[PDB]
Design an enzyme around this catalytic site. Structure first.
Site, mmCIF file in Angstrom:
data_model
loop_
_atom_site.group_PDB
_atom_site.id
_atom_site.type_symbol
_atom_site.label_atom_id
_atom_site.label_comp_id
_atom_site.label_asym_id
_atom_site.label_seq_id
_atom_site.Cartn_x
_atom_site.Cartn_y
_atom_site.Cartn_z
ATOM 1 C CB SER A 42 40.498 37.813 35.424
ATOM 2 O OG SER A 42 39.322 37.275 36.005
ATOM 3 C CG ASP A 47 42.188 33.819 42.225
ATOM 4 O OD1 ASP A 47 40.977 34.037 42.522
ATOM 5 O OD2 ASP A 47 42.662 33.945 41.060
ATOM 6 C CG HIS A 96 41.222 37.516 40.558
ATOM 7 N ND1 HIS A 96 41.119 36.327 39.873
ATOM 8 C CD2 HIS A 96 40.824 38.474 39.721
ATOM 9 C CE1 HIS A 96 40.665 36.582 38.657
ATOM 10 N NE2 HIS A 96 40.470 37.877 38.544
HETATM 11 O O1 LIG Z 1 35.252 41.275 41.882
HETATM 12 C C1 LIG Z 1 36.201 40.902 40.878
HETATM 13 C C2 LIG Z 1 35.678 39.703 40.097
HETATM 14 C C3 LIG Z 1 36.512 39.000 39.231
HETATM 15 C C4 LIG Z 1 36.063 37.878 38.561
HETATM 16 C C5 LIG Z 1 34.767 37.460 38.748
HETATM 17 CL CL1 LIG Z 1 34.350 36.057 37.817
HETATM 18 C C6 LIG Z 1 33.872 38.164 39.615
HETATM 19 C C7 LIG Z 1 32.421 37.805 39.885
HETATM 20 F F1 LIG Z 1 32.021 36.710 39.276
HETATM 21 F F2 LIG Z 1 32.173 37.590 41.164
HETATM 22 F F3 LIG Z 1 31.527 38.805 39.658
HETATM 23 C C8 LIG Z 1 34.376 39.273 40.282
HETATM 24 C C9 LIG Z 1 36.548 42.036 39.908
HETATM 25 C C10 LIG Z 1 37.131 43.226 40.634
HETATM 26 N N1 LIG Z 1 37.332 42.905 42.057
HETATM 27 C C11 LIG Z 1 37.917 44.038 42.748
HETATM 28 C C12 LIG Z 1 38.301 45.162 41.798
HETATM 29 C C13 LIG Z 1 39.537 45.789 42.342
HETATM 30 C C14 LIG Z 1 39.561 47.274 42.002
HETATM 31 C C15 LIG Z 1 40.372 47.505 40.730
HETATM 32 C C16 LIG Z 1 41.323 46.621 40.227
HETATM 33 C C17 LIG Z 1 42.027 46.923 39.072
HETATM 34 C C18 LIG Z 1 41.766 48.111 38.446
HETATM 35 F F4 LIG Z 1 42.442 48.431 37.314
HETATM 36 C C19 LIG Z 1 40.851 49.005 38.897
HETATM 37 C C20 LIG Z 1 40.152 48.695 40.051
HETATM 38 C C21 LIG Z 1 40.132 48.086 43.161
HETATM 39 C C22 LIG Z 1 39.307 48.946 43.883
HETATM 40 C C23 LIG Z 1 39.807 49.697 44.938
HETATM 41 C C24 LIG Z 1 41.142 49.578 45.240
HETATM 42 F F5 LIG Z 1 41.644 50.319 46.267
HETATM 43 C C25 LIG Z 1 41.993 48.749 44.558
HETATM 44 C C26 LIG Z 1 41.479 47.995 43.514
HETATM 45 C C27 LIG Z 1 38.202 41.724 42.173
HETATM 46 C C28 LIG Z 1 37.476 40.512 41.637
#
Ligand SMILES: OC1(c2ccc(Cl)c(C(F)(F)F)c2)CCN(CCCC(c2ccc(F)cc2)c2ccc(F)cc2)CC1
Ligand SMILES: OC1(c2ccc(Cl)c(C(F)(F)F)c2)CCN(CCCC(c2ccc(F)cc2)c2ccc(F)cc2)CC1
Ligand SMILES: CCCCCCCCCCC(=O)O
Ligand SMILES: CCCCCCCCCCC(=O)O
Ligand SMILES: CCCCCCCC(=O)O
Ligand SMILES: CCCCCCCC(=O)O
Ligand SMILES: CCCCCC(=O)O
Ligand SMILES: CCCCCC(=O)O
Ligand SMILES: [Ca+2]
Ligand SMILES: [Ca+2]
Ligand SMILES: [Cl-]
Ligand SMILES: [Cl-]
Ligand SMILES: [Cl-]
Ligand SMILES: [Cl-]
Ligand SMILES: [Zn+2]
Ligand SMILES: [Zn+2]
Lengths: 382, 382
Positions: free
Chosen positions: A113, A304, A346
């Site tokens: 990402s 994604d 993603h």
């Molecule tokens: O929201 C995201 C995003 C990405 C890009 C953009 Cl551009 C934007 C924006 F723009 F919208 F803001 C947002 C970021 C994080 N989101 C969920 C995070 C997952 C979390 C996790 C994942 C990996 C880790 F090492 C630790 C925790 C987790 C939580 C609980 C769990 F049970 C499992 C995983 C996915 C997408």
């Protein structure tokens, strides 16, 4: 000793917490429980490391941090930058994974990402310096970080991106980078700056670290003066279409770097030609996936979960070539775009969607070994 | 006033917390956010109520509690029972949803999961009393609960079960009812018995309520002498194959009651003939669904996440008839088994699987209206 002559550094994205900097219970960024990227690749005798950089910081801040993560030293965001945006010039100081790093000794960079963007900007600094810092140290003397000088070449072998929003994301435009939710993100940062906190969410240069003798009320007060609240020097902004474009406009192809991209789709075409998240899209990306998939421009819809396909394939106005899964990805100078991975979301790329049985660990282990192979090839074709 | 002459009482299952007894953030048991069963059916002018009974208690204890929930009064588990298992004879005291309840005034009972069993046992007591309690009040005099007397007939119009493990579940046998996990369940109960707690997990009769002037250490000590740790008078046991059988052996068909059942499937057949949970099976049932679906006996494998199909259709030793969706379910005295709902998991029945977009609220609202219709039919065919 190691099967790969150049170390591989994995650079996490936005909200990325890794290593010693995660909460007590928290998913493991690189591989989840499906495939422990760092641990396993190491067991097989590959030299691999995971960078720790600002979870909420701008790409600029992260890019500076990345450099210091590898090289070691005290993060220097540069005097002009600091002065422009209104945050500390100096930051954390890093041990350094590779203290000898210099032209000649190279590193492979793979970024998930936003980590993709961060990697690209760091290479920019290495090759072409930072104009504003060069300019400022011209006018006002002082010492300048080597990162900002320019002329440091032959230090990165490969740039490889997993689901990077090269061209930004509507999710940022219409949600992440809004007023209301920036305030939430900043509050979280403010709170995790409290004197009892052991995690660093990456905005401390903005003053979000409570002093051990300061009341929370004085803390709140001190920090509400910070430019962070209305600044653009932050991840939410860099992930917008404008924000991402800016980085595209100021980057260029290094003709010795082997550039490669992977992309996932995890939406499906609905009644009106709009795109909706598949069951299996990790649930926290449900709303973002719908915002993206309901975009007016039709070519911006397949996604994604948080990054639309146009955004992931390649930075839009840079050279690219569509590639095969079997053919060696060995071309320098051009974005080798691997075929879209059907039904990967993603987070599937990092194996943390424990809800998705369809995405098995053996599959993920192939994917990463895949990447290491390509990297070995780049090594062998110099 | 109400479109239904006899009130409808919905009885939650194991771990069920409803109403004023749920945590600060907690799903709403009857309908989730998909269809507010109690609120909506009321808006449409049906008299409906949700019982609150022991979340961890045996079917016996819950059955007694259910009686008092409806009738009002101080829970009386009965002197012989109390003495046999080694827990307080008296319990909470309930306002009463229906203070006048007696032969002639009737109630419709619908039970999710273990709620199904609880309803069955309560009706048994009403009709045929409790022999042990009759016997003990013989020998030793005193007062006896009316519940245990026998001869109270014509008080329940219908018994209707959603995903009830009539014949028990391997999930209980090989997980829920094991030593290690009973100890965890009991610890949770012990803890939520603390003097700062406002929720009642339903095992206080066993001594899990800290006294206001007692230290936590003395509490731990006092309560470790309780029979609960090694007793069978608990939900985990009643949900085993043996446990469920016991209830089957001591229950019989009331030929004025209209008996009806629903069942879900949410597994799929794998390579070797074993059953695995569908994507869409609420994730907390992942492991149970696999334990069940890998059963040696093949007819015991198809499951809704925690209850195998054999178990849900009907109690195995009692009369049943397969029914159609359109066939009005109006036969007294026999288990009318409705056709399996494909892709409904244990919790889909109550609409709390917010991860499952495939299970829409409009669908759930039809199902519940469905049930009310059948009930209206029973009313109109007397
Ligand atoms: O929201 C995201 C995003 C990405 C890009 C953009 Cl551009 C934007 C924006 F723009 F919208 F803001 C947002 C970021 C994080 N989101 C969920 C995070 C997952 C979390 C996790 C994942 C990996 C880790 F090492 C630790 C925790 C987790 C939580 C609980 C769990 F049970 C499992 C995983 C996915 C997408
Ligand atoms: O584990 C269960 C079980 C059932 C029968 C048997 Cl026999 C066995 C046994 F013994 F074999 F182990 C176990 C009980 C509850 N499990 C999950 C709990 C659901 C929960 C919920 C449910 C109802 C509510 F009102 C509120 C919350 C919840 C949590 C978080 C959430 F986001 C949504 C819902 C499903 C099955
Ligand atoms: C003797 C009482 C201590 C019990 C252990 C911890 C319970 C949490 C108390 C909750 C609160 O103080 O709000
Ligand atoms: C509260 C209901 C019991 C489910 C216990 C099994 C879940 C443990 C698996 C770990 C996870 O939830 O990711
Ligand atoms: C992202 C949520 C963090 C989990 C906190 C639970 C801590 C514990 O009970 O040890
Ligand atoms: C395996 C035990 C489950 C409870 C803590 C894990 C929470 C998380 O997914 O971060
Ligand atoms: C899903 C389990 C619920 C138990 C209720 C509680 O911990 O208060
Ligand atoms: C915030 C994510 C849902 C609950 C995760 C778990 O219980 O493992
Ligand atoms: Ca997925
Ligand atoms: Ca489901
Ligand atoms: Cl956090
Ligand atoms: Cl250097
Ligand atoms: Cl900190
Ligand atoms: Cl209590
Ligand atoms: Zn900055
Ligand atoms: Zn009892």
């Amino acid at each position: 000793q190691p099967l790969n002559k150049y170390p591989v550094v994995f650079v996490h994205g936005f909200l990325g917490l890794v290593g010693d900097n995660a909460p007590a219970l928290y998913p493991n960024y690189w591989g989840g429980n499906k495939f422990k990227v760092i641990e396993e690749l190491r067991k097989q005798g590959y030299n691999v490391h995971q960078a720790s950089v600002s979870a909420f910081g701008s790409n600029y801040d992260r890019a500076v941090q990345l450099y210091y993560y590898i090289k070691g030293g005290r993060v220097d965001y540069g005097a002009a930058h600091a002065a422009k945006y209104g945050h500390e010039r100096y930051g954390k100081t890093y041990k350094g994974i590779m203290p000898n790093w210099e032209p000649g000794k190279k590193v492979h960079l793979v970024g998930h990402s936003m980590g993709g963007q961060t990697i690209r900007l760091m290479e920019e600094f290495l090759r072409n310096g930072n104009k504003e810092e060069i300019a400022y140290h011209q006018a006002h003397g002082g010492e300048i970080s080597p990162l900002f000088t320019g002329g440091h070449n032959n230090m990165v072998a490969s740039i490889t991106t997993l689901a990077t929003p090269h061209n930004g994301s509507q999710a940022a435009d219409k949600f992440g980078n809004t007023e209301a939710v920036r305030k939430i993100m900043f509050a979280l940062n403010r709170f995790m700056g409290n004197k009892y906190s052991n995690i660093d969410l990456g905005l401390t240069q903005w003053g979000f670290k409570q002093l051990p003798n300061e009341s929370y009320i004085d803390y709140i007060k001190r920090v509400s003066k910070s430019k962070i609240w209305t600044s653009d020097d932050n991840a939410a902004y860099d992930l917008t279409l404008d924000g991402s474009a800016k980085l595209n406009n100021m980057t260029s192809m290094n003709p010795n770097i082997t550039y490669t991209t992977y992309t996932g789709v995890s939406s499906h075409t609905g009644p009106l030609g709009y795109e909706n998240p598949d069951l299996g899209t990790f649930f926290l990306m449900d709303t973002t996936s719908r915002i993206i998939g309901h975009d007016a421009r039709e070519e911006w819809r397949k996604n994604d979960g948080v990054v639309p396909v146009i955004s992931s394939l390649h930075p839009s106005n840079q050279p690219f070539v569509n590639v095969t899964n079997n053919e060696p990805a060995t071309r320098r100078g051009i974005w080798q775009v691997k075929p879209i991975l059907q039904g990967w979301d993603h987070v599937d790329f990092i194996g943390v969607d424990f809800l998705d049985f369809k995405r098995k660990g053996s599959e993920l282990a192939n994917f990463y070994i895949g990447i290491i192979n390509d990297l070995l090839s780049v090594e062998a074709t110099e």
